[PDB]
Amino acid sequence: ESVTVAGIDCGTNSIRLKIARVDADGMHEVVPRILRVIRLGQDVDKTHRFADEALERAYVAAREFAGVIAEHPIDGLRFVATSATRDAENREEFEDEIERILGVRPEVIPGTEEADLSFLGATSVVNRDDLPAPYLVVDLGGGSTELVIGGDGVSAPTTQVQGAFSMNIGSVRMTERHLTNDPPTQTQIDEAVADVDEHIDEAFRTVDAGKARTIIGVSGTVTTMTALAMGLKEYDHTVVDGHRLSFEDAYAVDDKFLRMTRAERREYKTIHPGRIDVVGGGAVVWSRVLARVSEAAKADHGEAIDSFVASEHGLLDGIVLDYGRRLLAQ
C-alpha cells in the first residue's frame, strides 16, 4: 500500500513543487523539486501585505504547477504557506485564488510546525555512520529562520524534536531592512548583525542549541553559499547535498559575497538570478547562527562546532513524507 502525494512549499523568496510515492520505506521521487523564485514576500516586511506583482508571479507559478500535477494522478496535495503569508494581511485573497487554480486552500502553518516538518525532511535520510546526533537543523528562509534540534539517541530519539523556534529573520527580510546600499556599508552590516543576534538570544531561550553535535543547514542561502565555497561554476544539487563545509570556508564566502556588488555577484552563475539581490541578507544570518551555535556548544559540553552539512532536503520533503504517511492511515 502506497499513496502518491504532491506537495507545495510557498516561502518568502520562492515556491516549490514536489510529487512522490510514499510507503513504509520512506518516499520515492516522482518529480524532483521544481523551483520557481517568485519572491512573494517582496517588501512584505515593511508593508505587511503582498504586492500585486508578487501575487501575479505566484499565480503564474501556481498555474504551471497545476499543469505539472495534472500530468500524473495523485491521491492528494498539500499547499503549505510560510513566513511571507503569515505576515501578509491580505493573505485570504491570496489563498482564495490558489484554491481556485490548484483546488486546495493553502495552509498557513505556525512557525513551530514549519520547524518540525523541516526537521523531518532533513533528518529522515541522514547517514548515522557519518553524522553524530543531536542534529540541529537550521532552515534559513527568506523571511524566517527556524532552529530545530532532536535527541542524542540515548536519552531521547534522534528523530524526536527536543526544541524548535522560528525566528523572524531571513535573507530577504534582512536585506530589505538593513542592507540598502549596493554594496552594503559596514554600518548597515552592523545593524543587520545586531538585529540577528537579538533574535538568536530569544531563540536560545527556547531551543537548547548547545546540545548539537551536528549542524544541518537547509534551503536557498545555505546551499548556494556552499556551492560557492566549492567553486562550482553552475549549480548542481547532487554535489552540494551532504557536503561538509568548514566554518572557515563558510565565514569566508559569506563575507566575500555579502560585501560584493550585485553586478559582481552576477558573474557567479551558481547563484540563481532570483537570489542575487538577497544573498547578502542570508550571508549575515548564516554566519551569526553558525558562530552562536558553536559558542553554545562549547559552553554546553566543552566542544566547538567547526563545520556543518548542507542538505537539499528540508520543509518540502517533510511535507510530502508527513502527508504521505498521514494518508496511509486516513
What DSSP string describes 46-109?
A: HHSS--HHHHHHHHHHHHHHHHHHTTS--SEEEEEE-HHHHH-TTHHHHHHHHHHHHSS--EE-
Resolution (A): 2.4
Which residues, listed in sequence order, are joined to residue 149 by a DSSP beta bridge?
A: 136, 163
- Give helix 111-123 / helix 315-327 axis angle, nearest 10°: 90
Q: Which of 34, 38, 27, 37 is nearest to 3 (CA)?
A: 27
Measured torsion, CA atoms of residues 158, 238, 115, 62, in degrees rounded to the nearest 10: -150
> Which residue reads 542570508 in cell numbers?
282
**Within a 10 A sphere around the Cβ of 21, how many other Cβ atoms?**
17
Q: Cell numbers for 196, please give them.
A: 540577528
Which residues, listed in sequence order, are joined to residue 166 by a DSSP beta bridge?
A: 146
> Which residue reads 549542524 in cell numbers?
215
Expt. technique: X-ray
In the chain, what are the domains? 1-126 (3.30.420.40), 127-330 (3.30.420.150)
In the DSSP assignment, the letter for residue 269 is: T
Taking phi over 0 as left and psi of -120 to 50 as alpha, with beta for the rest, 39 belongs to left
**Quick one: which H or E segment has residue 253?**
helix 247-258
Residue 154, φ and ψ in degrees, nearest 5: -115, -65
Q: Cell numbers for 205, please give them.
A: 531561550
**Within a 10 A sphere around the Cβ of 50, how many other Cβ atoms?**
24
